[PDB]
Amino acid sequence: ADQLTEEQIAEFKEAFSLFDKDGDGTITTKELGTVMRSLGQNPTEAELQDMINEVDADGNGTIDFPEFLTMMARKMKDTDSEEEIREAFRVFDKDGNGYISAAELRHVMTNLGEKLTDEEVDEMIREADIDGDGQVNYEEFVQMMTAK
């Protein structure tokens, strides 16, 4: 993780929080095991340490968020590098949480005007949201920007 952007931290931190089931800040064999075999399959509980000790940099038996972050640095995001969508997201995002929300996008459009109805804002977000949390990523926002 030589250089990253704020969004890339913030979304991966949401990933790490979603992946860490007990919120201890670490990842153990029991934790990674169940959520992986929640998704249909089942690794045979030997791949799990082979998952961790492949990536555990200090060998403490846990995966802290920096080890989690440098793993995603090797599973790096694609070549979507710009400058204006970067600037467009800062003007939109008031608190700078990295996730432009419903009421924020209502707020910015209100200062431009055009009187969006509450249902009409929900039609904007639900189509733009790829994974389905009702919030737009930085990665999701550029796909509405470039082409349809």
Q: Which residue from 84, 96, 92, 99 is spatially nearest to 133, judged by alpha carbons?
A: 99
Site string (88-117) toward another protein, x via CB under 8 A: x-----xxxxx----x--xx-xx-xxxxx-
Smaller CB separation from Ca ion, 78 or 131: 131
Rounded to 5 degrees, φ, ψ at 40 are: 75, -65
Residue 62 labelled as part of a binding site: yes
Task: Say if residues 56 and 63 touch (Cβ distance below 8 Å).
Answer: yes
Residue 70 labelled as part of a binding site: no
Q: Which does 42 bind (CB under 5 to 8 A by kind): another protein, Ca ion, none?
A: none
Helices vs strands, H then E, count in the chain: 8, 0
Annotated binding site: 20, 22, 24, 26, 31, 56, 58, 60, 62, 67, 93, 95, 97, 99, 104, 129, 131, 133, 135, 140
